Each structure stands twice: as C-alpha cells, then as structure tokens.
Amino acid sequence: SLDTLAAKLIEKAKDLRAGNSTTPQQHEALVGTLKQVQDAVYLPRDDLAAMQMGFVTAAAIRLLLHWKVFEKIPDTGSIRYEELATQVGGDVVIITRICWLLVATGFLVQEGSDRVAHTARTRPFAGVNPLRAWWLMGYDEYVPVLLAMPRYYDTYGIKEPTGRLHTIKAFTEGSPELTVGEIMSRHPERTANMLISMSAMASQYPHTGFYDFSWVAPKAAESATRPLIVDIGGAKGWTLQAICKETPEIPISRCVLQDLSGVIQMVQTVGDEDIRSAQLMAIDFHKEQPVQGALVYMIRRILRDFGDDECVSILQHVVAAMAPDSKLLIADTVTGNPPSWFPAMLDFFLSTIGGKERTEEEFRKITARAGLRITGIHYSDKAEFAMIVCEKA
C-alpha cells in the first residue's frame, strides 16, 4: 500500500542516518512494494507514458555514452555544461537538453542552473565495467532486433523460430544464412564488449547447492576406470571444480570438461590446479560425444540456446555414448505455465537466436525423442532453475 511503502522509506531513511547498510533483500522488498503501488495507482495512460519515457531515457544514455560525456562528469562534485561541451567539442545547447532529460528522471543532478553531476545511477557509465558493457550489448545488439520482429515474422510467417540459421538476429544483421556466432566473428569490438557482459551475468545462476552430486562417490570407489562426470560445454571448468570441492570424494582427475578448442587452450594455460588436472577435450557437441560410458553427462544452460530438433540431436549423441546406468543431467530453467518474469524475458530474447525456456512438458518431449526418461527435477531457489535428471528409457 501507500502506507507500507512510506514505512519502508522511513526505515531506509533511518538506517541511512545510522550508517547501517541496507541489505539486498531489503532493497528488493522496497522496489517490490513500489511496483505494487504503481501497478495499483497508474492508469493505462500512465503506464504507456512511462514506457515511452523509458525509450528516450535509454536513447539519451546511449547518446551520452557515444559522446563520452559520463567520463567527463566527475565522480563527485559538478561540472559546468559549458565546460562539458568544450571537452566534447559539441554545442552546449543540445548537450544541455540531453542532460535535462536525465535530470528530470533523476539520473543526473543539477547543482545550480549551469552545472550537472552524477548519481549512483549514472556512475557505472563513466568507465569500463561489466554493467556498462551489458547495457550497451543489450541496447546495440538487441533493441534493433526487437524492432525488426514484425518484419521478420512477415517474412518467415508467424512460426516459432527454431533454426540456428535464419534467426531474427541474423535476419536483422542482414546475413540470415550465417549463424549468430559466425556473424559475431566478423565483429571484434562488439565481440569484445560481449565477453565482458556475457561473463558477468553467468554468475547469477547457481552451480551447486540445490542438487546432491555425492551419489557419484560410490562408483568412484567401486571402479578405478569409469569416467565420472562429463561437463558438455562447461567453459572454464568452474562447475566441475565446485562440484569436486563440495564433494572431495569425487576425484576431479576422473571428470571431463568438453568445450571448443579455443576455450580448452585457455584452461590449460592460465587455468587453476584442479581444472587442469581434469581431462580437457576440444569437441563439437553438435556432432560428437567421444567419452563413452561415463556415469554422468551434464548439459548446463545450453539447451535453452537451441530449437527442439537441435536439442534432440545433441541429446541423441550423448545417449549413444551412455551406458545403461548412465545419467544425463540437464541444468536449465523449467519455466512454469505461465512463467515468472525473468524467465519470460529470457525466453523472449532467446527467440532472436532460435532458443527458448522450456516447460516441464516440453522437456519431456525432447528427452523422449532422444530415448530418455526424466526421473527427477530438483529446483534451485532462483527463477525455476532446476536440475533435470534423465536415464535411458
């Protein structure tokens, strides 16, 4: 209500005078209560106007980034508009009008009528960092594709995009006959910025803590030879390291990391003690799975990137290598019907590259098509992220 929102502002205001640090959960509770009050108070005209304002605040921020203006505003204190325009080489009038939009939305602050200053909301834009990179990637790489969607579906029909080719991203870029990865290989700077961002937001999903891997330990003791955990597309090998430190009875010596040759070379050179002690193979999981009869094959946050047929083909390669008692673990979102907002928004983005978040029923369909049977689903506490346990059917 309006009253509980005021109560949380009073608590915040108090904790700030006392120098106590707000907690993350406290911050979300306050943002949540605000959104509930706005939902209750805003009329449709208010929602639509706020949506339009979001467009121009984003465009203002994009233009000031392009002009390198956030770098020139000091961390603290104020800079004169005239001084800012001189350092940019631009007309003070248009630079002032753009800042005025951000002043009226509380992104910037004016200290007189001629000086402007940062807030906590704009300091991330004043230098290189993962959040700025993520912001720019989503704006430059995603918003144009969002605008092209009606045109895209006019062209291909109102159909779920499921291929790796003729994606909406590639269609927007003008090369529908290339994959997104081939497009990005033609674009070093955009790929560089994407690494910084794609790496940061991976750490928002948990690797362990909601699924017990320790049942692998008995087999590690009955047999000296059987490979234990094969991580398919596991990147730097951090998942395997965590699993084996959570359960030291699982020798990382007997686990396998599979990725692309360029990523396996980085694991060997500047990788740490134990990941380097594990078998590292450069593979293409679209076409092959060399390790035969391992106890566990793991596919974490990968199937979301592909359509059903591509997932079934990936799964069928793994099933061909599985022994009768092998498990195939899929770590991914099992979205609800209907889905919560974060997975719903990820699913929307994924439609630009041919992927999707899948419901439980959709996961049963693709696993059944691969000759698998889901025996369990173990949920994390984070946005329906689960461990899906499968066996040969």
Ligand X SMILES: C[S@@+](CC[C@H](N)C(=O)[O-])C[C@H]1O[C@@H](n2cnc3c(N)ncnc32)[C@H](O)[C@@H]1O
Residues contributing to the annotated binding site for S-adenosyl-L-homocysteine = 259, 284-285, 300
With CB under 5 to 8 Å by kind, the binding choice for 158 among ligand X, its own copies, none is its own copies
CB of 137 to ligand X, least distance (A): 10
Establish if 233 lies at the interface with ligand X (CB under 6 A): yes
Q: Give CA–CA dist 334/384, Å, rounded.
A: 6
* Touching ligand X, residues 185-204 (CB under 6 A): 185, 198, 202
Tell me which of 285, 342, 348, 379 binds ligand X, using CB under 6 A.
Answer: 285
Question: Is there a cis peptide before residue 130, judged by omega within 30 degrees of 0?
Answer: no
With CB under 5 to 8 Å by kind, the binding choice for 181 among ligand X, its own copies, none is ligand X
For ligand X, the nearest residue by Cβ is 181
Establish if 260 lies at the interface with ligand X (CB under 6 A): yes
CA angle 389, 390, 391 (to 5 degrees): 135
Tell me which of 200, 217, 235, 321 binds ligand X, using CB under 6 A.
Answer: 235
Q: Give CA–CA dist 247/263, Å, rounded.
A: 25
122 CB-contact burial (10 Å; exposed 0-12 / middle 13-18 / buried 19+)? buried
Which residue, among 60, 205, 134, has the nearest Cα to 349 in the 3D structure?
A: 134
Which strand ranges, in their side-by-side order, compose the sheet holding 327-333? Answer: 279-282, 256-259, 229-232, 296-300, 327-333, 385-392, 372-379
Tell me which of 28, 154, 284, 325 binds ligand X, using CB under 6 A.
Answer: 284
Are the C-beta atoms of 145 and 93 separated by less than 8 Å? Answer: no
SS3 at position 305:
helix
How many other CB atoms are there within 10 angstroms of residue 35's CB atom?
Answer: 10
Tell me which of 115, 190, 219, 301 binds ligand X, using CB under 6 A.
Answer: 301
Q: Among the candidate windows 39-47, 242-250, 297-305, 377-385, which touches ligand X by CB under 6 A?
A: 297-305
Nearer to ligand X, 118 or 164 (CB): 164
DSSP 340: P
Q: Give CA–CA dist 56/107, Å, rounded.
A: 13
CB of 71 to its own copies, least distance (A): 15
Which residue, among 213, 220, 228, has the nearest Cα to 323 in the 3D structure?
A: 228
With CB under 5 to 8 Å by kind, the binding choice for 121 among ligand X, its own copies, none is its own copies
CB of 83 to its own copies, least distance (A): 15
CB of 73 to ligand X, least distance (A): 31
Sign of the CA dihedral running 358, 174, 200, 103: negative
Length of the chain: 393
Establish if 91 lies at the interface with ligand X (CB under 6 A): no
Annotated binding site for S-adenosyl-L-methionine: 259, 284-285, 300
Q: CB under 8 Å, gap of 24 or more: what pairs does 107-112 form?
A: 107/57, 107/61, 108/73, 110/78, 111/78, 112/78
With CB under 5 to 8 Å by kind, the binding choice for 104 among ligand X, its own copies, none is its own copies
CB of 267 to its own copies, least distance (A): 25
With CB under 5 to 8 Å by kind, the binding choice for 105 among its own copies, ligand X, none is its own copies
With CB under 5 to 8 Å by kind, the binding choice for 284 among its own copies, ligand X, none is ligand X
Which strand ranges, in their side-by-side order, compose the sheet holding 79-80? Answer: 79-80, 115-117, 109-110
Nearer to its own copies, 144 or 376 (CB): 144
CB of 136 to ligand X, least distance (A): 15
Q: Give CA–CA dist 21/3, Å, rounded.
A: 23
* Touching ligand X, residues 169-188 (CB under 6 A): 179, 181, 185
Nearer to its own copies, 57 or 279 (CB): 57
Are the C-beta atoms of 205 and 382 separated by less than 8 Å? Answer: yes
Footprint of ligand X (CB under 6 A): 179, 181, 185, 198, 202, 233-235, 239, 258-260, 263, 283-286, 300-302, 305
